[PDB]
C-alpha cells in the first residue's frame, strides 16, 4: 500500500491552489523516493514539474511505484476541506482506482476522511534539452507576482530582457506602454547574466504560476535564447515546483 503523511498540510493545499487553474488533469508518480508530478496544459504552452522527497514526510510508505491519474479541480476542493495546520495523510492500495486523504485537526479531536476517484490518463513523455543558463534571476516571489499583475493590466504579453544593468519587463496596450526594470544590489534580488537575452511571453500563464507564491519566499527565473522560460519555487527543503513556459513567434 501507499501511505504518505505530511505534518504541514498547508504545503499540499498551496500546491493544488497553484496547479488547478493552470492544469485540470494530472498523473501522480509515486515511489520509494517521494512524490513527483509532471503535466502540460491543454495548449501545451506550459509544463509543470513537482518534486516531493520522501524525507520531507513524517511517515512514508510506498511498496509499489504508482502513477495516479487525478482531477486537480476535484482534488483542490477536498483540500479546501483541510485546515492550514491539519496533518494530511495520503493513502492508496497497490492496485488503486481511488485515493484516500486524511486530515487530522491539531485539536486532536477532529479527523476527516475523504476518498476520491482516479481517472485513466494519457501521459506524455519528454523531451527537454537542459538549459543554457544565459540569464538567471533570484528575487522575492511576491514582487514577481506583483510585477505580473501590474503589467497584466497594461497588456496581454511581456517582453523580458537581460543585461548587467539588470533585467527588464515591458508591456504595451491601447492605454499606453509600461516598463519595469530590476537591478541587482543584494546581498534580496540577484541577477547573474552570462549573455544578453530577449524573449516575449504571455502574462496569463505567469499569473497562474505566481499562485505558487505562498510556497517560497523567493522565486528563480532561468531564461535562455529561443528556449522555454523556467520559473522555479523551492518547497522548504522538500523539493521544488518548476514551471516551463513557451515564448512567442
Amino acid at each position: 500500500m501507499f501511505e504518505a503523511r505530511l505534518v504541514q498540510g498547508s504545503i499540499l493545499k498551496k500546491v493544488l491552489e497553484a496547479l488547478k487553474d493552470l492544469i485540470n488533469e494530472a498523473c501522480w508518480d509515486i515511489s520509494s523516493s517521494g512524490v513527483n508530478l509532471q503535466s502540460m496544459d491543454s495548449s501545451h504552452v506550459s509544463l509543470v514539474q513537482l518534486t516531493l522527497r520522501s524525507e520531507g514526510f513524517d511517515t512514508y510508505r510506498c511498496d509499489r511505484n504508482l502513477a495516479m491519474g487525478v482531477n486537480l479541480t476535484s482534488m483542490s476542493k477536498i483540500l479546501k476541506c483541510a485546515g492550514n495546520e491539519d496533518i494530511i495523510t495520503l493513502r492508496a492500495e497497490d492496485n488503486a482506482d481511488t485515493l484516500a486523504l486524511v486530515f487530522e485537526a491539531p485539536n486532536q479531536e477532529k479527523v476527516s476522511d475523504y476518498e476520491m476517484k482516479l481517472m485513466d490518463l494519457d501521459v506524455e513523455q519528454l523531451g527537454i534539452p537542459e538549459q543554457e543558463y544565459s540569464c538567471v534571476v533570484k528575487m522575492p516571489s511576491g514582487e514577481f507576482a506583483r510585477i505580473c499583475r501590474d503589467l497584466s493590466h497594461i497588456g496581454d504579453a511581456v517582453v523580458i530582457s537581460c543585461a548587467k544593468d539588470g533585467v527588464k519587463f515591458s508591456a504595451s496596450g491601447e492605454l499606453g506602454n509600461g516598463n519595469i526594470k530590476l537591478s541587482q544590489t543584494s546581498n534580496a534580488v540577484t541577477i547573474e547574466m552570462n549573455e544578453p537575452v530577449q524573449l516575449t511571453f504571455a502574462l496569463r500563464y505567469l499569473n497562474f504560476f505566481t499562485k505558487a507564491t505562498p510556497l517560497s519566499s523567493t522565486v528563480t527565473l532561468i531564461m535562455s535564447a529561443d528556449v522555454p522560460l523556467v520559473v522555479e519555487y523551492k518547497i522548504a527543503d522538500m523539493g521544488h515546483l518548476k514551471y516551463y513556459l513557451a515564448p512567442k513567434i
Binding site: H44, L47, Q125, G127, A246, K248
Partner: peptide, 14 residues
C-alpha cells in the same frame, strides 16, 4: 507575435 507551444522546443510523445 504568435504564441509558441512546448512541442516546438521539447520532444513530446505519448
Amino acid at each position: 507575435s504568435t504564441q509558441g507551444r512546448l512541442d516546438d522546443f521539447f520532444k513530446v510523445t505519448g
